[PDB]
Structure formats: C-alpha cells, structure tokens
Amino acid sequence: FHEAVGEIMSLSAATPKHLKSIGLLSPDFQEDNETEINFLLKQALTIVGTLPFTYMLEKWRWMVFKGE
Ligand SMILES: [Zn+2]
Incomplete structure (x- = not known):
C-alpha cells in the first residue's frame, strides 16, 4: 500500500x-x-516487464521453502 x-x-x-x-x-x-x-x-517495459519475473521468482522461492 505504501509504495502504491x-x-x-x-x-x-x-x-x-x-x-x-x-x-x-x-x-x-x-x-x-x-x-x-x-x-x-x-x-x-517497466510495469509489465517486472511482473512475470516477480511472480516466477516468488513461485520458485515458495516451492523451495515448501520442499517441493
Ligand atoms: Zn518509495
């Protein structure tokens, strides 16, 4: 919310x-x-550029921390 x-x-x-x-x-x-x-x-190139990368990085980190 703050950054938004x-x-x-x-x-x-x-x-x-x-x-x-x-x-x-x-x-x-x-x-x-x-x-x-x-x-x-x-x-x-900024807004839609940073979205798939952010989602993929968070999905990878969540799957690593969950042991999958
Ligand atoms: Zn700021």
Missing part, C-alpha cells in the same frame, strides 16, 4: 495534461497517438 500510494502520484504527475497546466509544457503542444504509444510502451 507513492506511485499513484508519480503516475498522474507525468501526464502532459498536468505538465501543460504547470507551465513546463507549452500550451501549444498537442499530444499525438504515436507519442502516447511511445510513453505507454516505455511504462510497459
């Missing part, structure tokens, strides 16, 4: 909608469907 609450803020803070309202991103900047794809893939 810490990460939800970072997820929203990185949106171009907030950036163009905070002044760092110029208002005359329209996000394209390709930049959205690039950002989503960059996020995915």
